[PDB]
Design a protein around this motif. Sequence first.
Motif, PDB file in Angstrom:
ATOM      1  N   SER A  46       0.755  -1.176  -0.050  1.00  0.00           N
ATOM      2  CA  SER A  46      -0.031   0.028  -0.025  1.00  0.00           C
ATOM      3  C   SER A  46       0.872   1.354   0.006  1.00  0.00           C
ATOM      4  CB  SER A  46      -0.963  -0.308   1.134  1.00  0.00           C
ATOM      5  OG  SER A  46      -0.174  -0.293   2.416  1.00  0.00           O
ATOM      6  N   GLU A  47       2.165   0.927   0.231  1.00  0.00           N
ATOM      7  CA  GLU A  47       3.005   2.358   0.348  1.00  0.00           C
ATOM      8  C   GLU A  47       3.726   2.322  -1.234  1.00  0.00           C
ATOM      9  OE1 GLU A  47       5.664   1.129   3.552  1.00  0.00           O
ATOM     10  OE2 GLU A  47       4.256   2.280   4.850  1.00  0.00           O
ATOM     11  N   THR A  48       3.627   1.341  -2.022  1.00  0.00           N
ATOM     12  CA  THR A  48       4.374   1.704  -3.448  1.00  0.00           C
ATOM     13  C   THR A  48       3.609   2.566  -4.185  1.00  0.00           C
ATOM     14  OG1 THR A  48       4.862  -0.832  -3.287  1.00  0.00           O
ATOM     15  CG2 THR A  48       4.957   0.118  -5.311  1.00  0.00           C
ATOM     16  N   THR A  49       4.709   3.529  -4.592  1.00  0.00           N
ATOM     17  CA  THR A  49       4.324   4.562  -5.599  1.00  0.00           C
ATOM     18  C   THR A  49       3.283   3.765  -6.524  1.00  0.00           C
ATOM     19  OG1 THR A  49       6.631   5.561  -5.500  1.00  0.00           O
ATOM     20  CG2 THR A  49       5.087   5.974  -7.447  1.00  0.00           C
ATOM     21  N   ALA A  50       2.104   4.550  -6.614  1.00  0.00           N
ATOM     22  CA  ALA A  50       0.923   3.989  -7.504  1.00  0.00           C
ATOM     23  C   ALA A  50       1.292   3.771  -8.839  1.00  0.00           C
ATOM     24  CB  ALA A  50      -0.275   4.979  -7.342  1.00  0.00           C
ATOM     25  N   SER A  51       1.963   4.693  -9.418  1.00  0.00           N
ATOM     26  CA  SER A  51       2.340   4.589 -11.004  1.00  0.00           C
ATOM     27  C   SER A  51       2.985   3.397 -11.225  1.00  0.00           C
ATOM     28  CB  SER A  51       2.802   5.770 -11.437  1.00  0.00           C
ATOM     29  OG  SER A  51       4.336   6.171 -10.854  1.00  0.00           O
ATOM     30  N   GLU A  52       3.855   2.830 -10.145  1.00  0.00           N
ATOM     31  CA  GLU A  52       4.747   1.691 -10.333  1.00  0.00           C
ATOM     32  C   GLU A  52       4.055   0.369  -9.894  1.00  0.00           C
ATOM     33  OE1 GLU A  52       8.201   2.944  -7.945  1.00  0.00           O
ATOM     34  OE2 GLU A  52       8.794   4.435  -9.392  1.00  0.00           O
ATOM     35  N   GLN A  56      -0.106  -6.172  -9.595  1.00  0.00           N
ATOM     36  CA  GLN A  56       0.387  -7.063  -8.561  1.00  0.00           C
ATOM     37  C   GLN A  56      -0.567  -7.034  -7.324  1.00  0.00           C
ATOM     38  OE1 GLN A  56       2.361  -4.616  -9.852  1.00  0.00           O
ATOM     39  NE2 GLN A  56       3.828  -5.685 -10.874  1.00  0.00           N
ATOM     40  N   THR A  57      -0.383  -8.089  -6.513  1.00  0.00           N
ATOM     41  CA  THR A  57      -1.192  -7.877  -5.364  1.00  0.00           C
ATOM     42  C   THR A  57      -0.293  -7.360  -4.314  1.00  0.00           C
ATOM     43  OG1 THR A  57      -2.581  -9.975  -5.703  1.00  0.00           O
ATOM     44  CG2 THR A  57      -2.020  -9.525  -3.458  1.00  0.00           C
ATOM     45  N   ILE A  58      -0.867  -6.421  -3.432  1.00  0.00           N
ATOM     46  CA  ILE A  58      -0.219  -5.630  -2.504  1.00  0.00           C
ATOM     47  C   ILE A  58      -0.362  -6.128  -1.020  1.00  0.00           C
ATOM     48  CG2 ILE A  58       0.092  -3.703  -3.850  1.00  0.00           C
ATOM     49  CD1 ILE A  58      -2.062  -2.426  -2.169  1.00  0.00           C
ATOM     50  N   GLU A 107      10.009  -6.293   4.152  1.00  0.00           N
ATOM     51  CA  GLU A 107      10.303  -4.876   3.593  1.00  0.00           C
ATOM     52  C   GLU A 107       9.306  -4.503   2.670  1.00  0.00           C
ATOM     53  OE1 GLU A 107      14.669  -7.077   3.839  1.00  0.00           O
ATOM     54  OE2 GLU A 107      14.407  -5.388   2.535  1.00  0.00           O
ATOM     55  N   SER A 108       8.676  -3.295   2.754  1.00  0.00           N
ATOM     56  CA  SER A 108       7.469  -2.653   2.227  1.00  0.00           C
ATOM     57  C   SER A 108       8.141  -1.552   1.022  1.00  0.00           C
ATOM     58  CB  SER A 108       6.742  -1.908   3.067  1.00  0.00           C
ATOM     59  OG  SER A 108       5.735  -1.140   2.373  1.00  0.00           O
ATOM     60  N   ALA A 109       7.942  -2.000  -0.373  1.00  0.00           N
ATOM     61  CA  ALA A 109       8.461  -0.936  -1.174  1.00  0.00           C
ATOM     62  C   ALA A 109       7.802   0.331  -1.200  1.00  0.00           C
ATOM     63  CB  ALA A 109       8.446  -1.884  -2.613  1.00  0.00           C
ATOM     64  N   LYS A 110       8.607   1.291  -1.231  1.00  0.00           N
ATOM     65  CA  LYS A 110       8.179   2.446  -1.814  1.00  0.00           C
ATOM     66  C   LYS A 110       8.226   2.828  -3.017  1.00  0.00           C
ATOM     67  N   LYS A 111       9.412   2.237  -3.846  1.00  0.00           N
ATOM     68  CA  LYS A 111       9.697   2.410  -5.301  1.00  0.00           C
ATOM     69  C   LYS A 111      10.103   1.049  -5.673  1.00  0.00           C
ATOM     70  N   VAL A 112       9.769   0.822  -6.767  1.00  0.00           N
ATOM     71  CA  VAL A 112      10.483  -0.454  -7.726  1.00  0.00           C
ATOM     72  C   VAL A 112      10.801   0.119  -8.945  1.00  0.00           C
ATOM     73  CG1 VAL A 112       8.823  -1.865  -6.177  1.00  0.00           C
ATOM     74  CG2 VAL A 112       8.022  -1.267  -8.445  1.00  0.00           C
ATOM     75  N   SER A 115      11.171  -3.007 -14.533  1.00  0.00           N
ATOM     76  CA  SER A 115      11.337  -4.504 -14.712  1.00  0.00           C
ATOM     77  C   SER A 115      10.164  -5.221 -13.678  1.00  0.00           C
ATOM     78  CB  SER A 115      12.598  -5.214 -14.497  1.00  0.00           C
ATOM     79  OG  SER A 115      12.524  -6.727 -14.583  1.00  0.00           O
ATOM     80  N   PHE A 116      10.180  -4.627 -12.480  1.00  0.00           N
ATOM     81  CA  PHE A 116       9.113  -5.073 -11.462  1.00  0.00           C
ATOM     82  C   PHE A 116       7.793  -4.732 -11.661  1.00  0.00           C
ATOM     83  CE2 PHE A 116      13.216  -5.301  -9.035  1.00  0.00           C
ATOM     84  CZ  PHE A 116      13.310  -6.758  -8.793  1.00  0.00           C
ATOM     85  N   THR A 117       7.698  -3.532 -12.086  1.00  0.00           N
ATOM     86  CA  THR A 117       6.243  -3.057 -12.544  1.00  0.00           C
ATOM     87  C   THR A 117       5.567  -3.916 -13.702  1.00  0.00           C
ATOM     88  OG1 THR A 117       6.926  -0.684 -11.780  1.00  0.00           O
ATOM     89  CG2 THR A 117       4.977  -1.162 -13.303  1.00  0.00           C
ATOM     90  N   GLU A 118       6.481  -4.004 -14.546  1.00  0.00           N
ATOM     91  CA  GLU A 118       6.034  -4.686 -15.714  1.00  0.00           C
ATOM     92  C   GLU A 118       5.818  -6.158 -15.643  1.00  0.00           C
ATOM     93  OE1 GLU A 118       8.845  -1.663 -18.520  1.00  0.00           O
ATOM     94  OE2 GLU A 118       9.455  -3.526 -18.007  1.00  0.00           O
ATOM     95  N   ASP A 119       6.377  -6.776 -14.542  1.00  0.00           N
ATOM     96  CA  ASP A 119       5.777  -8.254 -14.416  1.00  0.00           C
ATOM     97  C   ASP A 119       4.717  -8.263 -13.305  1.00  0.00           C
ATOM     98  OD1 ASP A 119       5.784 -10.625 -13.709  1.00  0.00           O
ATOM     99  OD2 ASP A 119       7.764 -11.268 -13.346  1.00  0.00           O
ATOM    100  N   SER A 120       3.470  -8.296 -13.677  1.00  0.00           N
ATOM    101  CA  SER A 120       2.309  -8.333 -13.155  1.00  0.00           C
ATOM    102  C   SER A 120       2.285  -9.646 -12.095  1.00  0.00           C
ATOM    103  CB  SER A 120       1.325  -8.278 -13.557  1.00  0.00           C
ATOM    104  OG  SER A 120       0.889  -9.479 -14.650  1.00  0.00           O
ATOM    105  N   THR A 121       3.053 -10.563 -12.407  1.00  0.00           N
ATOM    106  CA  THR A 121       2.996 -11.907 -11.799  1.00  0.00           C
ATOM    107  C   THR A 121       3.852 -12.180 -10.368  1.00  0.00           C
ATOM    108  OG1 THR A 121       4.813 -13.136 -12.976  1.00  0.00           O
ATOM    109  CG2 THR A 121       2.568 -13.127 -14.006  1.00  0.00           C
ATOM    110  N   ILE A 122       4.718 -11.174 -10.120  1.00  0.00           N
ATOM    111  CA  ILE A 122       5.686 -11.480  -9.217  1.00  0.00           C
ATOM    112  C   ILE A 122       5.196 -10.138  -8.197  1.00  0.00           C
ATOM    113  CG2 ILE A 122       8.191 -11.170  -8.285  1.00  0.00           C
ATOM    114  CD1 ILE A 122       8.913 -12.560 -10.769  1.00  0.00           C
TER     115      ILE A 122
END
Length: 330
Positions: A46-52, A56-58, A107-112, A115-122
């Motif tokens: 829920s902390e990950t930059t929305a555009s990134e 993915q499930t958060i 570890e909660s991502a604020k930024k990714v 390559s991570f954004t583009e992989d919806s399965t991980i």
Amino acid sequence: STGSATTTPIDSLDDAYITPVQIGTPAQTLNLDFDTGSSDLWVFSSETTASEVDGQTIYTPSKSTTAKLLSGATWSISYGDGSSSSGDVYTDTVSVGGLTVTGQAVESAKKVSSSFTEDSTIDGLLGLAFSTLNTVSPTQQKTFFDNAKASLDSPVFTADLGYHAPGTYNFGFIDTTAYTGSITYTAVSTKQGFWEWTSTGYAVGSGTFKSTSIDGIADTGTTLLYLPATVVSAYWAQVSGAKSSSSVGGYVFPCSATLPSFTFGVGSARIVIPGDYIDFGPISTGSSSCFGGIQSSAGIGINIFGDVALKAAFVVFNGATTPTLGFASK
């Protein structure tokens, strides 16, 4: 205690494998990439930059009654493929295949990176290398395995990756029905924080075995097999039309080829990677040039026994006081 979880390829090429992991209370299930080449358990959140975030499930710590901010802690990681992520840290309850750790650093991502954004399965990574590589600052954190170890029936986990099929990660026991023959154990150096070992040599196809020491890491988070340029050249020389392409970024071969197997040594034992495992398909959609699954490690600085190699074996990650690695055919 023990745990057992199925791991599933993310796509038709086995680019990576995802394993469901329960985080928090009530459980939030995220599909994580178990990575024996790194030591951070990080998630889209829920902390990950929305555009990134793109499919993915958060993890939402505010919805977990057992989540607690690890005050002041931050993390930031860069991987060998140039991808990266960073953020802050919670502790929470984490379960894998029925094995539960309380107080695990999540570890909660604020930024990714893209390559991570583009992989919806991980939905994140679960590191299984040594905790000395963990990036949390100012207080380094332990991996899920390190935290679980004392509770396990045996201080081990095993990787049994499938070729174009699901496989299994087990914690705390060796499933003697999951492999053929015997397990050959080999020494590990933890000096670089990896499951680093020395292969005793290789063969190409039906060729003679070349006895030569090849230091490398067992890395479930790397797709391909990266070996010294001499070894890789010897392999691709047996494939008509294969060449190293600087434009593509490695060895390519005609999609009409039948690839030879590749054998690597573990002590006096041998693991055979079938030729089909070395085919990573067209370089771009519809191309008749195919990407090879064995590539040069030159300029990586380390040899990497990634999924191409590991999926040909049943692999024991022995985290006893003196760690070792075991390989069996299957």
